[PDB]
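Co-fold these.
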Amino acid sequence: SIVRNYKPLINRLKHYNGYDINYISKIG
Amino acid sequence: PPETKLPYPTYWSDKKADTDTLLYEQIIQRDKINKYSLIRETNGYDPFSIYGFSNKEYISRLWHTLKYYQDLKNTRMKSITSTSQKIPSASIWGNGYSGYGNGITNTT
Amino acid sequence: HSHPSDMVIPDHLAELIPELYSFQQLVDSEKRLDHFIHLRNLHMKRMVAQW
Amino acid sequence: LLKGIQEFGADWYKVAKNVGNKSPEQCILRFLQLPIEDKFLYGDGNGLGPLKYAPHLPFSKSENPVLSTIAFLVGLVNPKTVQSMTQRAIQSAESIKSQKEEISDQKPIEHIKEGSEIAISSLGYRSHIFATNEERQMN
Amino acid sequence: NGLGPLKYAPHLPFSKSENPVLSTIAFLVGLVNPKTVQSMTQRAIQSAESIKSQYRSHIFATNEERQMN
Amino acid sequence: RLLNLYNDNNRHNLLNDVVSFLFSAIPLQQVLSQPSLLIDQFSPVISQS
Amino acid sequence: ELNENARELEQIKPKIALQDKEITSVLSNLHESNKRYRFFKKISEDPVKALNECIASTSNALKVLSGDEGYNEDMVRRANFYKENEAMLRENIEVILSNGRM
Amino acid sequence: KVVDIDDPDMMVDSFTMPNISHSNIDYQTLLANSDHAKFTIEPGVLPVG
Amino acid sequence: ISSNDAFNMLSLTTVPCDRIEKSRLFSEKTIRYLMQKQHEMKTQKPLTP
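Predicted complex below.
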């Protein structure tokens, strides 16, 4: 027998406030 | 023990609600929610509109705005060059003063 | 590229942390020292030119 | 619940473990005398301005943003100073029915208003703690 | 009350997934009365100070740090 | 009013300040520390000071 | 002796340069942590007004970084704005009409 | 033997319990970990927005 | 960016306000320096014609 483990979700922040402001700032 | 796909999320806690099972329910529900909202957070729904807030629609709008302003600057340089060669050209700012008192703008 | 205003402790940090006041004093004392040493150098050169 | 609050403080997993058959968020939300499921309050969607337009899945799988945020923000602040902060929180094993009767006959929006007041005050208190630690770092 | 976050419609720097607390609080700040919030946070600070009770006293607390200063 | 606001035997603080400012404008330590090029570049300000 | 003193100065200088580098680094860190302290203090002293100010400033920063300008849309869709700015509107309407732009 | 199944809706036997009963950390460690590129959130224990 | 990071540290950290420890006020370098200087200060011609 083997156990099936579900490991919860750990994430790093992708955007700053829903947006990535580096690219937005370039284009702006 | 074959896989069973886990019917409706609160399936477990409806039989002898415990602390660990309830914590497990909370965890899996919030994980699903987080994943779906992140996918919609940056991309958006299948219909694609430039008046969208997501991330890709905002940057698409910025790119289109930049392209418009670049071609506008091109026409402005065209106007300057054409007026330098003594060919009167119209401008995005108008003619200024026309032939009256205050003379004529739209010279070099 | 370093800016001459980096060394300024504005006015309100120094009354939140009083030691910053004393820090400024130390800086000023150092200046005195430097100038004194500078003068000494000049003086010594002059004496040699005399001798 | 009240014994576990007396023994452990701001460690709500051990409080729930003591309770046996409940989740830490439910223990926090009963400690403040608030419901769950978020629909018994502001189920519409005019006291609450922009909450009308907040999206929600119909007929199934309710999510509670407001109550979850409240239980999270108050779960950080040492239940004793919470009991000192507001009178809504349960304060002793004998004060349960008294306080339940006193909160009775309130408008459904009064519950939201009091919950959010407790939450934002907890956030301000935590920010004060962070301010003192920043002063320490400056020194 | 007010429109709240919706008041800034074209530019809304909120993230339900990444910053879940700030969006909820942005919706909630409209309901509350701010004076009671000030009173409650001041009560919290005073109660914390009284619990720990039983010059920069808050910065230099241990006996050794005062002597080092 | 303005003179009392500035000086607050606290008299001739303005004279002292003006002359100390004028003296501090002559780059003595910098030119003497190292020499012809620097004084060639600074002769106008030294002259007028 | 002049040469000896010059030698000792030239030997002592590099450590002083290193310590000046470290001093500037520490000063920058002090500025950053003072920023953070002011932030947290403002939030703790009046939380509701502080949170409103924070939201407004973040939205305006996004607007400015995108290269955007103009009026707030929610303010100018309402009729009070046009019964309060009566004189401005009158002057503008006359100027636009008399020039043939309206 | 274990398996990292990593899919929410399939029936499982166990789950990695998240960080719920913490231990003392100092303020400077929080300052170091709060930066972007080192900050991680665990949405199972945070509120929904 | 910095305001984003500060608010993330404030609100998105699941650490009670008690479990946050205090950090040091004196690094060990300054402690060593202070003790050394205390020692050295514990150890510590009228114009002849």
